[PDB]
Amino acid sequence: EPRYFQLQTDHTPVHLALLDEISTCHQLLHPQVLQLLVKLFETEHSQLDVMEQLELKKTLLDRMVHLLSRGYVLPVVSYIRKCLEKLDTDISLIRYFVTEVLDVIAPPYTSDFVQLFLPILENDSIAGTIPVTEFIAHCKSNF
Amino acid sequence: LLLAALGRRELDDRDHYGNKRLDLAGPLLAFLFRGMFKNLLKEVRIYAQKFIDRGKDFNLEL
Amino acid sequence: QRIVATLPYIKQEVPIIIVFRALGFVSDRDILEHIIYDFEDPEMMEMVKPSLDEAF
Amino acid sequence: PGFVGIRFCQECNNMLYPKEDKENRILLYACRNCDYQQEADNSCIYVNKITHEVDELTQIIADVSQDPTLPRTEDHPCQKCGHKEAVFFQSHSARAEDAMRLYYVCTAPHCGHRWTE
Amino acid sequence: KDILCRLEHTTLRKVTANTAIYYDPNPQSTVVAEDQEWVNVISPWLLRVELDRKHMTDRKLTMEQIAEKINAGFGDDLNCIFNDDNAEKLVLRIRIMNDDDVFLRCIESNMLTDMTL
Amino acid sequence: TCGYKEVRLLAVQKLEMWLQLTRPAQDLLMSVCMNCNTHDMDVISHLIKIRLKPKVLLNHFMLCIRELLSAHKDNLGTTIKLVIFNELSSARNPNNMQVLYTALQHSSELAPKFLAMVFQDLLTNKDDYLRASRALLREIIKQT
Amino acid sequence: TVINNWLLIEGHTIGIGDSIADSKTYQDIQNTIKKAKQDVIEVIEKAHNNELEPTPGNTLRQTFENQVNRILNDARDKTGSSAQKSLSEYNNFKSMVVSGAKGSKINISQVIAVVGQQNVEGKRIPFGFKHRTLPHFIKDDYGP
Amino acid sequence: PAAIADATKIFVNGCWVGIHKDPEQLMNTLRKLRRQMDIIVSEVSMIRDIREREIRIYTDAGRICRPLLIVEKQKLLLKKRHIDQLKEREYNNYSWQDLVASGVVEYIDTLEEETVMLAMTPDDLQEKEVAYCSTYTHCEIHPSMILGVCASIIPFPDHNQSPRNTYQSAMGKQAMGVYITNFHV
Ligand SMILES: [Zn+2]
């Protein structure tokens, strides 16, 4: 519903935490959670400040990172790949997603996750600004 | 002044009606009466100074 | 940040400590006791540094 | 550190100005109109709190507990004396029209304890 | 935001937390007792400024840039030292390389007002 | 801490201003009433009409004023004359109707004759005072 | 000429009945205003307990003012829409507005639902008194 | 000068006349003297700034003031007996001055109105609710008293847009009636 985040004072809304608990308790609802998250991520909120929009996108992306940590990994990284090259999303948001993911994941990694997460970390708009050295070393040595 | 610069006191409001007074008929007529009584005394000095140079007494009614 | 006093029937601005010494208070305890009533506040002492320095 | 005040002369009772001597390697507070000198108990000649995060609890006096225009709470009892009623208000300093932090003063006339939630 | 910080004017007025002048005739035994072996690596008066983390990281500034700007703006007359990036105490100390108190006050006013980081 | 033994009074105003010290005010009033009971009505009749303020708080003092008015003879006659004359001096206090009620409550052929004498004295004075007497009588009738 | 002489037959008025709404709309307006006042109270409580995180680019005062103005503007818009939905085709305020002859939807909303926030120099009513807009409020009252 | 910091500065007509170490009982005594039509006349303004220790007493002319009912302990000092006496205003010679001299109403000017916690109606003086305040010191006699001569002619002025009230206050000075009874001479 429009004019909802405009009336939210806290940094993260409570309903996003309800989504986090939904993702934590059940794994069958993960595509629905990701569908709602990409619906909110693609929504342009012209009634908010640009920094307020940016921190709202960061909050939705934190929910996406939680969904990634709860086993729903590949579609989220696929959506970030879609957002990187064929969408005009903020590169700072992609960098924030990479920073949040690489601060919670540890080796080993599978071939599919590495093949889907390496190109967003080698896009010449992410690697230079953005640890990531350990991850790229492990990916170079193993894959 | 120091408390205003320190910020411990807020700056005074010019439009605050506690900082303002209303000059009614009394004070305005009193200001006029002060000016005109000063004038009346001044020509009393003028008349008495003119009539004292000849050493003669002067009438107050004049 | 010097404190200055604009006086009636004086054309040019006058430092406040000169006015205080002209009232008959040739000291610094007297003038600052008239100005600052609380010696445990050193910030007012910092803001009255330059007036005393200029009135040396 | 902390703010440094005025320390005064003993004879003419003017302010002591700092002075350096080339023999003792210690700071001197010399009044330069009646040449009285004094040993320096603190090396802090001058400080400048430019962020000036001032303690607003020091600037609040306990007399504001009997202001009839200030609101009251029964929900914040005094820590010092246990009195339930306390007035509350925001800071009015020029550095504090960027926050809405409440400051509480106990209503009971004996203590007048002030705190911040 | 990097270009914004490269465009927006920034002096020490907007980046330091508090500045203070002390008397430290022997740098091997400093009056603040803060890493005198760093102070080891000439005037007895020092200018000690202290910065805050938030305004330092908003501009993404580092102490090397500030020290080099001070040196470029003031010649070899000023010696600036800096440490404690990981010690949560953002301190630069400025001395004079060869009455000095008014000169430290003047250059402190110039640093806080009339030179651009 | 003494009763009468003077010409004027100083502790009456102090006990009136300090009343809201309320316990010593009752003792001071009782001592003053006991001292003026023997009566000496030249200056102890107009200065005894201290300005009151509390009604609910000083209901006990108002009740004790009835016993203070039980001194009778000159101490009641001069007090009633002063209370009657106080209406001509803009008696803007509770002593114009409640204090006269104590005399009215003790009207055992005392307040009626004194009121008739005061009305005769007011009528024997200068004119334009019948309206004031009628207003006083109406206020005394309505208040009691 | 043709339209005026047809208006002689049809007629056009405005009155009290064009300014009223039904009871359900009045309940909706009162519910929206109560919800907005509760929301402003909650934002005031959050800023008072220092639980209100400031938006980037402004301090706590500006972000509190932005939140309060957002809530009050949302209330004004919702109450205006609720008042506009209650208008019948026979309503003469609506008749003049949707013809474009006189008035606006804001005027209908102000007449029927709520007048809204009064502003001086783009901000709310200033603390002309000492931290009060009027002597009828408590100090540091930031409510609607 | 060491005693200035703890005491309250006292200004009479803007002239600092000394200090007092007990400002609350002093202000209570000054108010009690003003309410009783004593040596302090009713138009004297007595303002106590509490946050910074000052008591300002104003006596000079030009101060604009208005009467307000006095509220003590969430109760009006005005009782039914005052209204009953004012009903027969032409009979017992009870007047507005007797209402002032009873300590019921008092004149509060703008500077004293800073320190006044004021109730719009006696319906604000109800302890059953949270009541938003319990330290009310004064009450409005009627809230419509804020209007002037021309604005008091406007019927239902709270149902109009304010510029229209201003225009009516302008044009009521242009209306025709009988401007004075002795217009024939
Ligand atoms: Zn000396």
Ligand SMILES: [Zn+2]
């Ligand atoms: Zn307490």
